[PDB]
C-alpha cells in the first residue's frame, strides 16, 4: 500500500511491488519455501566465506605487497594491499567474482621470490573457496528440493495406509473387498466429525441425547476419549457378526 | 596464609568447572573484537624501511586496547585450559580404567594372550599396571584381587604380584592382622613422593587427546600474538566449530574428504599425463607473445609446464584455449583441438562435478541417517524389538511403554541407586542384579517380552 502511495511522487517505486507479489502464485511460492527452508545455513556458510577471505587477505598484506597493482605505466597510485580494508574489499569484490581465482588480477608471479609460495596460495584459495563453497550452496538447495519432496511422499504414504484415527493400516480393511475406502469414507472419515461438531454447537443443551450430552461434557472437559484410537466397530464385531 | 589459601583456590576452581562455555564464547567475541581493530592497519615506507604502523581513527584510543585485550586473551586462554583439565579429563580416564579392568577381568589381555604390539596406546597403559594408584576414579577397586582370583590360580601368582604391583601378596592375604598405625601428615615437604608412573601415563593420555591439543594450540597462538602481530587472527576460523550448525556442515564435508583427496590425486596424474603431450609435440605454442623474443616459454622445462597447466589451465574456466597461441596454423590443428576439448570436458566438468556430487551426497546421507534413527526410535521400545503395533492395540500405549514402562532413564537411576546402596541390604532382586552386573551379563534386560505378552491371555 505505502509503496503504491509513495509511487505518486512521479517515480519508479511501483516497480519494486511485483517481486514478492509473485508469492501469491502457488508454485513459485513452493520453490521459495524450499530455498527458505535452509537459508540460515546458507548465511553461516557466507560467514565462513567472510572469515576465510579475511584470513587470506593478511597473507598478501604482509608478504605479497609488490603485486596487487594495476600496472599503469610509470606509476602506481593504485595498490589494493596497503590499506587492509581495501584489500579485503579487493578480494571479496574481485577474487570471488573472477571465476578462476585471483590469477587474472595480479602481477605475474614468475619472478623468483616466493613464486611457489604465491602459487600454492592462489590454487588453495581457488579450490577451497570457489568450488567447495559454491558447491555447498548448490547442494543445500538441492537437498531442499529433495527434502520437501520426501515430505510429500511421506505424508501421502502415511495417509494412504491408515485411517488417521485408529493406527490401523489398510491390511485389515482389505480382508473384505474394497474395505479401506469404505472405512475412510463411510466409516470415520474426518469430515463427518466436523459436521457433528457444528451440529452439536448449533443445537441447544436441553435436547441432546445421552450420547450428545456426554460428548458435549467431554468436549468442554477437553478430553478426547470419544475417538477410538485403535478399535473401529469391526474388531469389536469380528467374531460375532462380521 | 597457607591453609585457607588452598580453600580459596579450591572454591575458585570448583567455580571454574561450572562455567567453561562462557569463557569460550567470550574469547570468540574477543577474537572478533581484536580482529575488527586489526583491520584498521596500514603500512608505509615512511614512519609517522618498512613501517607496519597502526592508523587509528580520529579518536585517540585504540593503541592500548590492543595491549590490554591481548593480555586478557592469553589470560582467559590459560584459564580455559585449566577448566578443561579440571572438568573433562576424568571422563576419558574413567573410560580407560574401565576398559582395562574389563580386559584383565573378563579378558586375559596382559596375562593370557598379549598386547597386540602395534596399538601404541595399547602399550602406553602397560606402564601403569604396577602402581597402586591405578584404579583411581573407577569405583570397584577390588580389581587386582579379582584378576588374581580368576587367572592367578593357573599362573604365577607372584607373576601377578610383580606385574600388577600388589607388593607382598602373601602379606596382603594377612596384612590386616596386627594393627593399623596412624602415620604423620607432614605434607609440603615429602609431597614429591607420588606415583610418578601414574602421573606420566595420565599426562600421555592428555597430551594425545585432540581437544586438549586444540585448546593448547589456541593458547599458544594467542601467546605468540604478543609479538605485536596478526597471529590472533588465525583463531576464529576453527573456533567457529563451537557453533552447532556450522560444525554439522563441516561434519558432512569431512564425512567424504578422503575420496575428495584421491580424486585430486587423479587430477594430478591426469594433468601430468597431458603435460607431456605438449612437452614433446606442441613446443612452439606455450609462449606469451612478447614481441621480438620469448625468454618465457613454459614447455621447455617439464616442471614449469606441469606448473603451467595446474596453475592456469585448471583455473581458466574454459580450458587452456585462452592461454595459448592460436592453433589455426596448418600443422596439427585438429590434434590441438581434440587435445583442448578433451582436456576441458574431462578434467573441468567431470571432476568438479565429482566434488560437487560428493558433498551433495554427504548432505543427503546425513539427512538419511537422521530420518532413519528417528523412524527406528519411534517405532520400537529400544529394549525389546517390539514395534508400536502391539502397544497400540490398547489406547495410546506406546507412549506409556516408552515412558511408564521401560524407558531408558529409569535404568540409569536404578544403577545409581544400586551403586549408592551397600551390599548387605540389597534384596534378592537387587543382589542378583549386582551379581549379574559384576559378571557383565545382560540377561536382566527382557529383549523380546515386556510384562504384557506374559500377561496377555491371563490379565491384560
Amino acid at each position: 500500500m505505502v509503496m503504491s502511495l509513495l509511487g505518486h511522487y512521479n517515480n519508479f517505486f511501483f516497480a519494486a511491488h511485483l517481486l514478492d507479489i509473485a508469492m501469491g502464485v502457488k508454485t513459485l511460492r513452493t520453490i521459495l519455501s524450499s530455498v527458505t527452508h535452509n537459508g540460515k545455513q546458507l548465511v553461516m556458510t557466507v560467514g565462513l566465506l567472510a572469515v576465510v577471505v579475511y584470513l587470506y587477505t593478511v597473507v598478501a598484506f604482509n608478504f605479497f605487497r609488490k603485486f596487487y597493482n594495476k600496472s599503469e605505466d610509470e606509476d602506481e597510485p593504485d595498490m589494493k594491499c596497503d590499506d587492509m580494508m581495501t584489500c579485503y574489499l579487493f578480494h571479496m569484490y574481485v577474487g570471488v567474482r573472477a571465476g578462476g581465482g585471483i590469477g587474472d588480477e595480479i602481477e605475474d608471479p614468475a619472478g623468483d621470490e616466493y613464486e611457489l609460495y604465491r602459487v600454492v596460495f592462489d590454487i588453495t584459495f581457488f579450490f577451497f573457496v570457489i568450488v567447495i563453497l559454491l558447491a555447498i550452496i548448490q547442494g543445500l538447495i538441492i537437498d531442499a528440493f529433495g527434502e520437501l519432496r520426501d515430505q510429500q511422499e511421506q505424508v501421502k504414504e502415511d495417509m494412504e495406509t491408515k485411517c488417521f484415527i485408529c493406527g490401523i493400516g489398510s491390511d485389515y480393511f482389505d480382508t473384505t473387498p474394497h474395505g479401506f475406502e469404505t472405512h475412510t469414507l463411510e466409516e470415520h472419515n474426518l469430515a463427518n466429525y466436523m459436521f457433528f461438531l457444528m451440529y452439536l454447537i448449533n443445537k441447544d443443551e436441553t435436547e441432546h441425547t445421552g450420547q450428545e450430552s456426554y460428548v458435549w461434557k467431554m468436549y468442554q472437559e477437553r478430553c478426547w476419549d470419544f475417538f477410538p484410537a485403535g478399535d473401529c466397530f469391526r474388531k469389536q464385531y469380528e467374531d460375532q457378526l462380521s | 596464609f597457607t591453609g585457607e589459601l588452598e580453600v580459596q583456590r579450591v572454591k575458585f576452581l570448583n567455580y571454574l568447572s561450572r562455567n567453561f562455555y562462557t569463557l569460550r564464547f567470550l574469547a570468540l567475541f574477543l577474537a572478533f573484537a581484536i580482529n575488527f581493530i586489526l583491520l584498521f592497519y596500514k603500512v608505509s615506507d615512511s614512519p609517522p624501511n618498512m613501517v607496519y604502523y597502526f592508523l587509528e581513527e580520529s579518536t585517540g584510543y585504540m593503541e592500548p586496547a590492543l595491549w590490554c585485550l591481548s593480555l586478557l586473551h592469553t589470560l582467559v586462554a590459560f584459564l580455559c585450559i585449566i577448566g578443561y583439565n579440571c572438568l573433562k579429563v576424568p571422563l576419558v580416564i574413567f573410560k580407560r580404567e574401565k576398559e582395562l579392568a574389563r580386559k584383565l577381568e573378563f579378558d586375559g589381555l596382559y596375562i593370557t594372550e598379549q598386547p597386540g604390539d602395534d596399538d601404541v596406546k595399547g602399550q602406553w597403559d602397560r606402564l601403569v599396571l604396577n602402581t597402586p594408584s591405578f584404579p583411581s576414579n573407577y569405583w570397584d577397586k577390588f580389581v587386582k584381587r579379582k584378576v588374581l582370583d580368576k587367572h592367578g590360580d593357573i599362573f604365577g601368582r607372584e607373576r601377578i604380584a610383580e606385574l600388577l604391583g600388589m607388593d607382598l601378596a602373601s602379606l596382603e592375604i594377612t596384612a590386616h592382622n596386627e594393627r593399623k598405625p596412624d602415620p604423620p601428615p607432614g605434607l609440603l615437604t615429602w609431597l614429591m613422593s607420588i606415583d610418578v608412573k601414574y602421573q606420566i601415563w595420565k599426562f600421555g593420555v592428555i597430551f594425545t587427546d585432540n581437544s586438549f591439543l586444540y585448546l593448547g594450540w589456541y593458547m599458544v597462538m594467542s601467546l605468540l600474538g604478543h609479538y605485536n602481530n596478526f597471529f590472533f587472527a588465525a583463531h576464529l576460523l576453527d573456533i567457529a566449530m563451537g557453533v552447532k550448525t556450522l560444525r554439522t556442515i563441516l561434519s558432512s564435508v569431512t564425512h567424504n574428504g578422503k575420496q575428495l583427496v584421491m580424486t585430486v590425486g587423479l587430477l594430478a596424474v591426469v594433468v601430468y599425463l597431458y603435460t607431456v603431450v605438449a612437452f614433446n609435440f606442441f613446443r612452439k605454442f606455450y609462449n606469451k607473445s612478447e614481441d621480438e623474443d620469448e625468454p618465457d616459454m613454459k614447455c621447455d622445462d617439464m616442471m614449469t609446464c606441469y606448473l603451467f597447466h595446474m596453475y592456469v589451465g585448471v583455473r581458466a574456466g574454459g580450458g587452456i584455449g585462452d592461454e595459448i597461441e592460436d592453433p589455426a596454423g596448418d600443422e596439427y590443428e585438429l590434434y590441438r583441438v581434440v587435445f583442448d576439448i578433451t582436456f576441458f570436458f574431462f578434467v573441468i566438468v567431470i571432476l568438479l562435478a565429482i566434488i560437487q556430487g560428493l558433498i551433495i551426497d554427504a548432505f543427503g546421507e546425513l539427512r538419511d541417517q537422521q530420518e532413519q534413527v528417528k523412524e527406528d526410535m519411534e517405532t520400537k521400545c529400544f529394549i525389546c524389538g517390539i514395534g508400536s503395533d502391539y502397544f497400540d492395540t490398547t489406547p495410546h500405549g506406546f507412549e506409556t511403554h516408552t515412558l511408564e514402562e521401560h524407558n531408558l532413564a529409569n535404568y540409569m537411576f536404578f544403577l545409581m541407586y544400586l551403586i549408592n546402596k551397600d551390599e548387605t541390604e540389597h534384596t534378592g532382586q537387587e543382589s542378583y542384579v549386582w551379581k549379574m552386573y559384576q559378571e557383565r551379563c545382560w540377561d536382566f534386560f527382557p529383549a523380546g517380552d515386556c510384562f504384557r505378552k506374559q500377561y496377555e491371555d491371563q490379565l491384560s
Binding site: - | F94, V373, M412, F413, L415, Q429, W442, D443, F445, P446
Partner: protein, 87 residues
C-alpha cells in the same frame, strides 16, 4: 491415597526384568530429587541423543546393551563430578 501417590510420583522409579524365576517382573525404587533434576539439563540430553544416534547408525546384537550400560555408568560419574562443584 491419591495425593501422596501424586507427590511421590516423580521420585518413584520403575523398570522390568527377566531374572531368577524365568518370567518377567517389575521393580519399584526411589529416585533422588537432585538426580532427577540434573537428568533434565541440556548437556545431558545432547549426550543422550548422541548415544541414540551412534548406537544405531552402527548397531547390531547385544553390543547395544553393553553400550547402554557404558553410557549409564559414564554419565553417573558425570553426575558425581557435576554434583561436587556447586556452591
Amino acid at each position: 491415597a491419591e495425593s501422596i501417590l501424586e507427590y511421590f510420583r516423580p521420585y518413584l522409579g520403575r523398570i522390568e526384568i527377566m531374572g531368577a524365576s524365568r518370567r518377567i517382573e517389575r521393580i519399584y525404587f526411589e529416585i533422588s530429587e537432585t538426580n532427577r533434576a540434573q537428568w533434565e539439563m541440556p548437556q545431558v540430553k545432547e549426550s543422550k541423543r548422541q548415544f541414540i544416534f551412534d548406537v544405531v547408525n552402527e548397531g547390531g546384537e547385544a553390543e547395544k546393551m553393553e553400550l547402554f550400560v557404558s553410557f549409564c555408568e559414564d554419565t553417573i560419574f558425570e553426575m558425581q563430578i557435576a554434583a561436587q562443584i556447586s556452591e
